[PDB]
Design a protein around this ligand. Structure first.
Ligand code: 2AM
Ligand code: 2AM
Ligand code: CA
Ligand code: CA
Ligand code: CA
Ligand code: CA
Lengths: 260, 259
């Protein structure tokens, strides 16, 4: 809890630094993103020059994520929200050691709420412990899914069936916060066909602590080594969405996947 | 009158704290408590006021007579159940068929959106700036995934979803109307909504020069349910004239079926 404390503090400074630029003011968003990852990357290597960093903004492209201590960071998850709402965005940081998860952090800057988790030690929202997730049926569940996905060829019919059955659907525009929302019980499931390592790195650690699960749309495991599709939910309904709704269209999904 | 405004603005907050207490004193229970507390408070004080709300409260009222309170005691009941937040008390007031005040109270955030006709719109003490026009292309819109599933309506809404910068869905109409009032969404749509879903957010919205209609570009009134398109004027004009009005007749059909 020296690396942890240090990770914990940095994500929070990075946030306040963001608030500080915003108030000093879509070219804005492009700087800020850049300036924030550059701040995160510079502060890390100045103390831990052996630590590797995989960033949204380009740092560590094609790194071996399984060697040494590896920070995977997205300085702003929810750029559009950042630009149009000036809120509902987050910094995401997962720290892996030898390929194994150590810590996750996702910080809702404008709410000033930090979701944090060290592996084996439980999940937190601010300083309140998160409870382990209960099982639900899709029919009493609220699902996180973007309307844009429902317009697609193939993918659309598939998500249609599952939107129809869901109690109801939401779309917040930040994958890290929505993974977090699942970890908090606020969404029973979240799904999307494409996401990059930094978008789920921080949040999966958190989720693993309250026993939620993450797979891609084909039920296979997620790694920080490459991009993928995403299905996150409590144990019972993840099993339900994959077994019933996705996996009979396996071949249609392997194909879009092999394309994308 | 000012007493009327004061009393209403007071009452909605008051009912709000009661909901925090009932929860803390731990939704169907909470929702009855809220609807009885509001209605009884209105009426102990204004026996002549009319009240229109859920479960046939005020049904077949003549909404153009006297003072009508159009109340949804918890808007976003599902978010209440599953999230214990992002729900709202919404209260719209009309007088002689005409809007007067609108209140939407985000209870767990403790934020009162409020407005009185011709005197600007507020979020607590802060004035809301008027909206600027946006095109659809740089706009985020509120539309629930459910509505892109429907056979004919889906097709119509796909068009606008593909076009917009991105879409969102929050599970509260009153907050999503309000989110347009704030500039937080540029537009929000849905094929069905009750008068108590929109009555409050509509007053707040026209005080920042936002626009309301149904999907056919007709005025919304508090005399029936309806479809809804809300936005800044520029893009409510782009959406209506470019993506909905070309299918006026499909929409008239779907509308006739739905109601
Ligand atoms: N290729 C892409 N295009 C748009 N959003 C993407 C994306 N890949 C991942 N995302 C993520 O999906 C969510 C968009 O609702 C965000 O979490 C967004 O990250 P970003 O905000 O940093 O672009
Ligand atoms: N069947 C229906 N007809 C009209 N409005 C509905 C509806 N079902 C849900 N809504 C309302 O539309 C929004 C999205 O569901 C919510 O504000 C919700 O109000 P409620 O939460 O009080 O049920
Ligand atoms: Ca980003
Ligand atoms: Ca991202
Ligand atoms: Ca309600
Ligand atoms: Ca309602």
């Amino acid at each position: 809890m020296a690396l942890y404390g240090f990770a914990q503090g940095l994500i929070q400074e990075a946030g306040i630094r963001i608030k500080q630029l915003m108030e000093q003011n879509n070219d804005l968003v492009t700087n800020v993103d850049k300036a924030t990852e550059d701040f995160i990357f510079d502060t890390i290597l100045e103390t831990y020059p052996n630590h590797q960093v995989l960033g949204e903004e380009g740092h560590g492209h094609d790194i071996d994520t399984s060697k040494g201590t590896v920070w995977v960071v997205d300085p702003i998850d929810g750029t559009l929200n950042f630009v149009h709402q000036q809120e509902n965005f987050a910094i995401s940081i997962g720290i892996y050691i030898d390929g194994k998860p150590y810590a996750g952090f996702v910080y809702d800057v404008m709410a000033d709420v930090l979701y944090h988790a060290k592996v084996g030690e439980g999940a937190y929202r601010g300083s309140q412990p998160l409870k382990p997730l209960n099982d639900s049926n899709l029919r009493q569940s609220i699902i996180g899914i973007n309307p844009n996905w429902l317009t697609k060829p193939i993918l659309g019919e598939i998500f249609k069936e599952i939107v129809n059955d869901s109690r109801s659907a939401r779309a917040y525009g930040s994958a890290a916060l929505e993974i977090v929302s699942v970890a908090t019980g606020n969404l029973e499931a979240y799904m999307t066909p494409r996401l990059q390592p930094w978008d789920f790195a921080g949040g999966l650690v958190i989720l693993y602590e309250v026993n939620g699960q993450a797979s891609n749309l084909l039920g296979e495991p997620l790694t920080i080594s490459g991009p993928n599709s995403i299905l996150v939910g409590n144990r019972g309904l993840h099993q339900e969405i994959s077994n019933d709704y996705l996996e009979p269209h396996h071949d249609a999904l392997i194909q879009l996947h092999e394309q994308r």
